[PDB]
Amino acid sequence: LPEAYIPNAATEDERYYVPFTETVASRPLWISPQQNRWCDILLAREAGLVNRHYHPHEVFAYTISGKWGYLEHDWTATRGDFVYETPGEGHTLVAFEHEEPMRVFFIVQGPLIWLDEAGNSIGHFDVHDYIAMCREHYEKVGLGADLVVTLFR
Amino acid sequence: LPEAYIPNAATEDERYYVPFTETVASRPLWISPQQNRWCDILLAREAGLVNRHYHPHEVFAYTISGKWGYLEHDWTATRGDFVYETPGEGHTLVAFEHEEPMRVFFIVQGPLIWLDEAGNSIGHFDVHDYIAMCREHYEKVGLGADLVVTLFR
Ligand SMILES: [Fe+3]
Ligand SMILES: [Fe+3]
Numbered sequence: 001l002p003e004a005y006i007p008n009a010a011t012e013d014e015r016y017y018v019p020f021t022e023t024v025a026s027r028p029l030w031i032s033p034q035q036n037r038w039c040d041i042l043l044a045r046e047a048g049l050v051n052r053h054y055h056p057h058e059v060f061a062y063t064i065s066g067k068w069g070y071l072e073h074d075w076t077a078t079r080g081d082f083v084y085e086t087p088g089e090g091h092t093l094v095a096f097e098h099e100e101p102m103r104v105f106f107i108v109q110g111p112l113i114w115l116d117e118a119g120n121s122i123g124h125f126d127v128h129d130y131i132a133m134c135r136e137h138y139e140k141v142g143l144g145a146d147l148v149v150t151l152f153r
Numbered sequence: 154l155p156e157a158y159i160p161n162a163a164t165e166d167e168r169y170y171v172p173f174t175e176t177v178a179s180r181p182l183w184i185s186p187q188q189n190r191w192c193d194i195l196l197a198r199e200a201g202l203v204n205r206h207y208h209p210h211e212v213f214a215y216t217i218s219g220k221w222g223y224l225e226h227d228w229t230a231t232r233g234d235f236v237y238e239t240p241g242e243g244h245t246l247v248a249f250e251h252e253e254p255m256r257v258f259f260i261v262q263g264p265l266i267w268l269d270e271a272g273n274s275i276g277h278f279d280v281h282d283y284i285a286m287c288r289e290h291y292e293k294v295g296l297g298a299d300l301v302v303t304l305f306r
Contacts, residue, residue, distance in 0.1 A: 006235040082159040083159075086155065153239070
């Protein structure tokens with residue numbers, strides 16, 4: 001099957017970004033239903049928060065714009081910064097209001113498992129959940145659910 | 154073991170870039186000797202070429218600056234463009250002379266296997282080769298070989 005080339009990944013066209021939390025949205029770029037893995041541009045136009053969760057596997061990121069981090073580490077990432085998260089580490093992603101929106105290229109190995117404050121597992125978000133959310137949004141905004149399927153490898 | 158945070162990944166400080174071919178160099182960001190996998194910033198300040206090779210596994214890229222591509226595909230990538238290469242596909246990477254240097258964030262699963270024109274396998278470049286090259290360079294330019302070891306996960 002073919003390579004993928006997606007020009008202007010962190011596009012200014014808002015239709016391509018699928019709401020994930022109230023303050024954070026994602027543009028899918030590449031999705032592997034068999035590997036439970038995907039690549040996306042994560043976007044927060046203002047202050048943003050993704051609730052605590054862990055990944056059984058690794059996460060890689062390259063910061064395109066803005067200012068973000070995880071509360072469980074001591075740094076904050078701005079344009080040009082690289083991040084790797086170790087498997088199994090629980091983390092809470094935050095985005096700060098900056099001149100530019102937070103835009104981050106992420107390569108994610110799922111599932112995410114949502115954690116309450118006690119550190120107990122309360123829900124999950126896996127590649128099928130991601131596909132379903134992206135197809136539903138893309139159909140609604142007029143891009144078509146079939147566009148999401150074109151991303152699959 | 155810890156997360157990795159590398160600020161200013163595609164740095165202007167030339168010491169961090171390790172010569173790979175005559176025209177192309179790489180800054181290691183993250184290296185997994187056990188997974189035969191690494192992440193880097195690939196840099197070409199002028200015209201550049203990486204000889205034909207294939208990867209038994211996948212490659213992901215996010216274009217930071219410049220203009221580059223693989224001769225075996227019909228596109229060329231510029232700032233902001235995402236690329237995925239399918240496992241087992243033989244490809245020849247080129248960089249064009251542009252206002253900015255070619256800078257690309259790559260997540261590579263090794264080995265690379267070098268190909269002659271007949272499509273026969275003539276050499277290889279694996280994670281141990283990469284570590285050895287990076288340690289040798291970093292020692293020479295004064296960053297220290299031990300810095301490379303700090304990248305390992
Ligand atoms: Fe996460
Ligand atoms: Fe390659």
